[PDB]
Design a protein around this ligand. Structure first.
Ligand code: 2Q2
Length: 300
């Protein structure tokens, strides 16, 4: 019948990735719940903009929604908790933190300081280091040029480990690897697959150095314009999408390694104790005083 608005939702994954399917599901549910009054247009592959630019757009009023997580720490320091290296043990552990009082504090700081509102969270598989030569311990890095996202803690940690990390938008990584500007990057297997990093990297080093969650978010200025009933619909759609996305994540854990191996990637076992010890030291040396007690608790 009537269509009152169309929310633009951007993310960095491709159309087979769990996040995309979840974003589509969110849109379907929200449309149903609002009798078509609120439509969602999904923009994959950073086609709406790079992550940092979408966050700025949400603040300025030009972007409605995105999938974003620890890059929010550039505005809300507590958001670094989404992705502390070696902190979270499992999906269940992360669900507890993200859904508990610590998670509520993180949510409120993101709203206040970044002017974006998390409405759902998606747990992720572990990040792994990819490279052109095997990397079995920190000693192997030897100044290796690598990409990290726009996440200050990741710059701190990877520098301390012995690499030379440069922050870059996700959609620029493939060409940067292809052109030899950087030699490696780090991400969960689902995103290595999504971005076809198998075409420009030889090795997946199983560092498993970060287990993290990420948020589906709506601009606080968009949220503010919605009626209470429509806010409720957004939350309900988001909850449905979250349950759906978890299933897709679990499916991907069964298949993504095999797929990447079929595309020629070699998986490398690492000296986990060495990586863990060195990374935890670097985290503690660089963590904001604001979240230090929580990190010390997680590391205990
Ligand atoms: O490497 C990336 O860019 C992605 O894994 C995510 O965007 C990253 O985890 C953070 O920027 C999420 O805010």
């Amino acid at each position: 019948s009537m269509q009152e608005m169309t929310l633009k939702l951007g993310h960095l994954a491709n159309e087979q990735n769990a996040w995309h399917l979840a974003a589509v599901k969110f849109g379907e549910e929200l449309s149903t719940l609002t009798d078509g009054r609120i439509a969602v247009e999904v923009f994959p592959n950073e086609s709406l903009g790079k992550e940092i630019d979408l966050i700025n757009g949400m603040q300025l009023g030009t972007v409605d929604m995105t999938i974003t997580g620890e890059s929010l720490q550039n505005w809300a320091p507590m958001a670094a908790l989404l992705a502390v290296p070696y902190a979270y043990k499992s999906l269940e552990h992360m669900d507890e933190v993200a859904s508990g009082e610590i998670g509520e504090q993180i949510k409120q700081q993101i709203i206040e300081k970044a002017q974006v509102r998390p409405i759902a969270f998606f747990a992720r598989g572990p990040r792994n280091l990819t490279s052109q030569r095997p990397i079995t311990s920190p000693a192997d890095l030897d100044g290796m040029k690598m990409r990290v996202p726009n996440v200050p803690l990741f710059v701190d940690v990877w520098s301390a480990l012995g690499a030379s990390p440069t922050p870059m938008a996700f959609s620029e990584v493939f060409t940067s690897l292809q052109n030899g500007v950087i030699d490696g990057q780090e991400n969960p297997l689902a995103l290595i697959r999504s971005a076809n990093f198998n075409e420009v990297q030889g090795y997946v080093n199983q560092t498993e150095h970060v287990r993290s969650w990420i948020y589906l978010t709506i601009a606080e200025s968009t949220w503010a314009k919605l009626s209470e009933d429509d806010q409720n619909a957004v939350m309900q759609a988001a909850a449905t999408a979250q349950e759906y996305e978890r299933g897709l994540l679990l499916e991907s854990l069964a298949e993504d390694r095999g797929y990447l191996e079929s595309k020629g990637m070699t998986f490398v076992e690492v000296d986990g104790a060495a990586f863990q010890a060195a990374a935890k030291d670097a985290v503690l040396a660089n963590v904001s005083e604001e979240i230090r007690p929580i990190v010390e608790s997680l590391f205990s």
